[PDB]
From TrEMBL, chains A, B, C, D, E:
Single GO MF annotation: metal ion binding
PANTHER family with a match to the protein in the record: NEUROTRANSMITTER GATED ION CHANNEL
Keyword rRNA processing: no
Protein's recorded name: Cys-loop ligand-gated ion channel
Record key words, sorted: Membrane, Metal-binding, Transmembrane, Transmembrane helix, Zinc
SUPFAM superfamilies membership: Neurotransmitter-gated ion-channel transmembrane pore, Nicotinic receptor ligand binding domain-like
Binding residues for Zn(2+): H43, E92
InterPro entries reported for this sequence: Neur_chan_lig-bd, Neur_chan_lig-bd_sf, Neur_channel, Neuro-gated_channel_TM_sf, Neuro_actylchol_rec
Source organism: endosymbiont of Tevnia jerichonana
First-listed, main subcellular location of the protein, grouped into a coarse class: membrane
Membrane topology value: Multi-pass membrane protein
Neurotransmitter-gated ion-channel ligand-binding domain boundaries: 1-129
Amino acid sequence: EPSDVFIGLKIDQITGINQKEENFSVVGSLRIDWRQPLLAFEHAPGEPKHRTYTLATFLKLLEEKQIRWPAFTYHNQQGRMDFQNRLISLSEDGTVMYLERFTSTFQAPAFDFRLFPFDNQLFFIHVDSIFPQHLFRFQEMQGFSGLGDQLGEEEWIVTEVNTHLTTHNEFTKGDASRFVLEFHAERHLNYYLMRILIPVLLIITVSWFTFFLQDYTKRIDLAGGNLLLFIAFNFTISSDLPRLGYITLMDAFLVGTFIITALVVLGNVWLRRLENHGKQALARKLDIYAITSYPLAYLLGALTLWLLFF
Amino acid sequence: EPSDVFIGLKIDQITGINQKEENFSVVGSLRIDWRQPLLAFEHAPGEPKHRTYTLATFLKLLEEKQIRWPAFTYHNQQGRMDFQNRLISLSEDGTVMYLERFTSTFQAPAFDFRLFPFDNQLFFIHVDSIFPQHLFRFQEMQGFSGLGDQLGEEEWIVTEVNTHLTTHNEFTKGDASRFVLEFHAERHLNYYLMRILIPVLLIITVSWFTFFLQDYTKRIDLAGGNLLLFIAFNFTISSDLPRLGYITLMDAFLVGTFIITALVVLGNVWLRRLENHGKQALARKLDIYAITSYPLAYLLGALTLWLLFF
Amino acid sequence: EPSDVFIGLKIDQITGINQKEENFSVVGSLRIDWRQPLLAFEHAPGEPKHRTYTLATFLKLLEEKQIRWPAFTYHNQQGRMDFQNRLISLSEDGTVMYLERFTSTFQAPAFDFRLFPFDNQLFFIHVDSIFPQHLFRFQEMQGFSGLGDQLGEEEWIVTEVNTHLTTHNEFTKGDASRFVLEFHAERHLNYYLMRILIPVLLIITVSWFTFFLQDYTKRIDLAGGNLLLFIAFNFTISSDLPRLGYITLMDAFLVGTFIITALVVLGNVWLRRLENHGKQALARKLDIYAITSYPLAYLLGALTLWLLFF
Amino acid sequence: EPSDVFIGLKIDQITGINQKEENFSVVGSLRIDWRQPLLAFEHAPGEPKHRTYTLATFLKLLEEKQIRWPAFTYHNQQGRMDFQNRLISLSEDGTVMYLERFTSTFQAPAFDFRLFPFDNQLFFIHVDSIFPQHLFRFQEMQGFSGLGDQLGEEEWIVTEVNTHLTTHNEFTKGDASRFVLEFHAERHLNYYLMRILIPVLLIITVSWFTFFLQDYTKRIDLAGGNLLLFIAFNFTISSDLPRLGYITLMDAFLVGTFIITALVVLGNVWLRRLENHGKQALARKLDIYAITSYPLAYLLGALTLWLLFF
Amino acid sequence: EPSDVFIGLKIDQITGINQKEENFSVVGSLRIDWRQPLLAFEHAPGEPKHRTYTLATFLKLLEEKQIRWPAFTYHNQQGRMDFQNRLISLSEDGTVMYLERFTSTFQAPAFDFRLFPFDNQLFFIHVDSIFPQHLFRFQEMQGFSGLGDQLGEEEWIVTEVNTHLTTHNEFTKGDASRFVLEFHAERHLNYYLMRILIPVLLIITVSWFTFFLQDYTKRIDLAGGNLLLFIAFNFTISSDLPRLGYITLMDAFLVGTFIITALVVLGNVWLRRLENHGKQALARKLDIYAITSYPLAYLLGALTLWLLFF
């Protein structure tokens, strides 16, 4: 029969969420319960009830008695796994409890930056069996799988946690078992409002205020300054994101703001050219419409963003 | 009975306090004293009184004689533990003295940046038992636990050190012992006064001085320059902090200064617009109130900061 | 006879494509099938049909029975190979199935940045035999070699995948077998259009608009600003590329734009000098030709780029 | 008796001096000479006179014959020690020559940046005994300890080298031996004069030249530019130093220059305000005193720096 | 007699040349041929002619039969050696062929930046014997030492390759053999002309053009802008080089350009001061000489650079 093996995984400390490379590094604890009748021994009172083994001697022993063992292979591993503790307790009934406390990095294909930064993300850890379902099978421990009390992260909040089992057909032609610990996560919006959004509002309001200065050269100079500012903020945002292949919300916001500020520059230049022709009346009439439409233009852009991306 | 095991830990050199990732890396020394009657031997004069073992042979031996051993698992470990020395001295009475000199990084969930940079922090190292309290128990060595003579750090000053034992219920259903070495720490304020605060005072004083220049265009230009400066300082502060989720004191200071400088820009623009209407008397009357209230506004902000955050 | 050895390699997750150092890091899975008659055993019902071994014990065993084994040496390895899992299944017929799941970085000599960023690239992994073809030989597994369902990369798209075998004469005087997994790749153009091309168009259009301002000092100032902007964008592009030895397309675009903007600066200066001589008619006549030719100059440059680099 | 053990250490290549984290990484060679009578063997002609061992087999052997061995523990180790070669030659007389060629990073608590960059520094490597002086003792090899022919460093010059032995009471209650290799080092001043000092002199001289421009608005603008420049240089210097807790010489120089430039800005603004009142005579009289005192102010600052910091 | 040992080393892929830390990382292959009569065995037909061993078992065997072995110690190793493959083939005649395929970083003391960037560099790998020449000696393999077909580097071109043997007296009092693989290298000049030299020429030509603007305030402003530009380029060059202790060619070029631009600023200021006195004739006469001498000054500087540094 296919012997049933119990799995319990626990992400204790999420040490980082590096979105640039699309990975997250965590400290995890893995527990495996496996009842193998052959490993049962004969013990006397006074002797220990449950033996303790380190990994190397345990595997050499199982090589001596010629017994298959499950091959817990991490599907989403990244970089080098850092085994910290690996202990095995062997019971008289023939049950091995395997503890592996580790830290490692895992990739998460499902970043959908279509709603950055408001987007909710979905991280997941996979534990597949190298040997197929015909030999072994993976169950779930009752009250041990999940997350911990203190995650030690500020930028990300865990909303929901889940665990289950599924079947794959990757390494062997037969079916194999994969234990999945899958948790959603959110982003705290305090940063982006504090040190991105507010400066943009301040600079855009200064740009709007500069419209009615008259003597249309200070207007051009201030507009050039604002161009510098948004280009710097584009640089910061560019650093903070990966080499994304489809237009994101914040990227669209910034490119639209670039286009609008350039339109402001060109508009003041055209008004200056008209004033060069001397037709002051045309400029005087157009200024009112321009200043009335500019914030209206921004609100129209906000409405079209909210409609299109939601 | 639950055999009593003595623990002594010593952080010799704190190699770094990386707040961006919320961790601190230290060089530590661990000592374990464990009296196991079975390990006692029979020795003759001429033979060594206390044997010496390296870790691998020691564990293989304990696997040969089938004795449980404590599993010192670091709860706050981060990255990979770097074992440097691991020696064991075995005495005739049956006492093993285990030395483990190491260096590693540990996470500290309790950063409360609500009082940055004045805030006091609390770092702590945890040594839990994988096996429950029913088998083993952790005591404290008398005069060995604590810190060292020379820490080799400048940015942080250790104020108080403490050590104790506590019980957890994480890895097993039973109770288990955790030895905790917990030390508070402070920040030296010399930096932030030297190369953050003073430049801000200089630039804000220049901004205030620019109020009474008359011919309100140099005022606008200087205000734009000051905007550039505070945006650069916002960039520096943004780099120096993690992706914090609740508004910090320095962040509030800088965002308020942004708002005030933008208000200055808008005020000079509005005065220019009023002068365009020709009502020089209104601008002349308003300038006195503006220049009188501006430093008063800054002092009011300082008072509200001191009240609200303390 | 030269025993036939089957190879199957699978790049599951491409963790990065670092073009600055000219390498790409991937998570890979390797499978080796090798039928060795000597390793066949004699088994009884009840005993396992196929034994399982870890690498260390397996190699010690093959050293005990004195059998050669293939030496899968990676030709393009870079940095340190990170063995994650290494298992061997030994069958009664005398067939070893060797699994090696790993992650590592590989160099790719064939980056031809002559068409950056539109250029298509060609990555490849090589598995050579340390022992010559006279002893062993490498075949290809039927339906296992290739790539996976989810690559977890956004900036690069795999267009075509291929696998084959070839002969080399590097390590030994005799012929040896190399298994090659070679895949082409493309670049997503969304970034460079979003946050490089559009800002350049905006700034160049502002530069063109500045031509007809009259009172040729604002022209000089705006041209200097544009010079600053293109120098910043040159800095960004310089960071994003390796220390390339032959002029790339984007580099040529930027250097040409530098030359054109400098020509604009010099032209406005020369017009100012002519106006100093008072010959306003010459400047008035030359301005029309300059503004008519400037965008024409840019289109001529675009045409010569498209012709020369394609 | 306490057996005498000879130590010889040699820093061959100093690979880096990272002052930001207060450490320096070096490639070192360690030699230990230890005469143990028990290890003596009985050999025949034809057999090797001095046996050679690798570390693992040697330690297993000493575990078989039950002999204590010295525990060379590095006190200033940092990060992970990288053993490259570890050989032991065993002589018929009973002398082991242990070679350990390594590379590793060591911390240096004694950086006194009070005289940056002119300050001389003092690096040191410590080799302590885990076992106390009652058992073993550390001597010094005659002509092997010291530095090498080619250090391969440019920024730092070794002035003096020294070696000795001392006693500590850290790991055990008894006395223990520490071998110390301590070398002073200097800094080459070519950089800071080339690419820090000269630009500061150029910009400060431009600031002084700007004093007598008349029409006090270009003065204000140039002063603002100079403010930008010194803020950029403050950024560079800030990057180049650690989070130092007591004011350094270069930091004081830069903060004083900030204060003086801000005073220049305020002075030109006050002169502009006085000119607004029309009292041109007061400004004309004050300009001479200001321009006469400004370089005098800088020389007074230089004199007070030289006096106070020396 | 001193047994002759053959060495063949091959740098297959030069993965990086990091001049900032003065090192270069390469992927290398090492081959050792050593004829030891004792290791010869007695074999029968059917048995393998040449045995194959991994490093650990081989060294344990040589420890069992008590035979010295050469200790290939890398003199220029840096960081941690990363053994990738280590195989040994043992022949019936008594010859061991040792293969070690690796990747590692090596330091190169001989960077002479006196001719940066035109300077030619000289990299070299050293393989010394820990045991002296009295026991072993190092020969050179005939047609295996050297470099490979594809180096996979763009910024550096290998001009000449050489190999030889020499004697040292470092680790032991006796003479010892060092095998040296030494190759010169060059720099591709395409970068520095493309994205350093041309922008400098453009900005310096703009500075020269600004001389004859009249109304000497735009001259001062443009000169300040040029000062900003060269300071930025000084920052870039400063990043790209190590903390060099003797003035380099590019550093001298940039510092001279700083001095000349500052002289331009001061000259325009002095002309403005003379115009303040009203003596327009003196300024008109001096402008011609200044504009005639400025490019002449640059050519004189180029000539003195070419003479002094060559």
